[model samples]
Target: GPHMADCTLGCKYLENNRWVSVSKSANIGDTLYIMGHSTKIGRGCKPETTEWSDAEIYSW
Candidate 1:
């Protein structure tokens, strides 16, 4: 599903060192590289800040 302004607002993934807009997915443990920080799949993107997340978990 695509992102909507009233809904997800979309998420981003690292592509060739660039952040590209993409629809949020159901991958709970998926790795997401937002800007320069590595984050996991968390809550939906809200209309608050450029950095959107809840809990930050790092794995090997």
Candidate 2:
């Protein structure tokens, strides 16, 4: 099943290479930022980008 959340401003997620939104209960709680690394390659990326790209979930 898809992850669910109470949207603060509005909910949107990457679907079919596009940002899609919820059809109901669109706004409620704090906004979430789902950060993850891209599948595409990026050799010699900037310091900040590289750092975040390889980062793992240490804790909540």
Candidate 3:
């Protein structure tokens, strides 16, 4: 189950760094899926914030 957003769960950045939270339970081994949008397909690839249209929980 997904926890509250206020809780700082364990999350490894894309750069691969170790992180933990001492105030709340961390989400370890949680699967996160990311998908890229096709709105900038031929726009020369400008930097933009990505959005997630779907998400799911695979395991603990």
Candidate 4:
């Protein structure tokens, strides 16, 4: 089961690279859902660069 309210984003960049900013209003405690699939069936995968990067929240 998946939470419909869960925030999710995707990116495909070179290994050891930074992911571009997608949102500006995201907060610290906010959850960022990264979605992707591995070629090997049922195999696990990891982020090429920063595994878990924080969202940069900006004021209006």
Error of 4 at 5 (Å): 15
1-60: candidate 3 lDDT, tens digit per residue: 956432232222222332322122222232222232222211122112223233211212
TM-score winner among the candidates?
1
Error of 1 at 39 (Å): 1.1
Q: Which is the leading candidate under lDDT?
A: 1
RMSD of 1: 9.9
Each candidate: what lDDT? 0.43, 0.31, 0.25, 0.30
Q: Rank the candidate models, highest TM-score first.
A: 1, 2, 4, 3
For every model shown, the clashing-pair count is 0, 0, 0, 0
Estimate the Cα RMSD of every predicted model relative to the unseen true structure: 9.9, 13.7, 14.3, 11.3
lDDT, model 1: 0.43
Q: Distance (Å) between predicted and true CA of 6, model 4?
A: 17
Worst lDDT window (10 residues) for model 2?
A: 39-48
Give the lDDT of residue 60 in candidate 2. Answer: 18
How well is each residue in 1-60 modelled by candidate 2, as lDDT tens digits? 875544222234455666555322222232223344422212221121212332322211
Global local distance difference test of model 2:
0.31
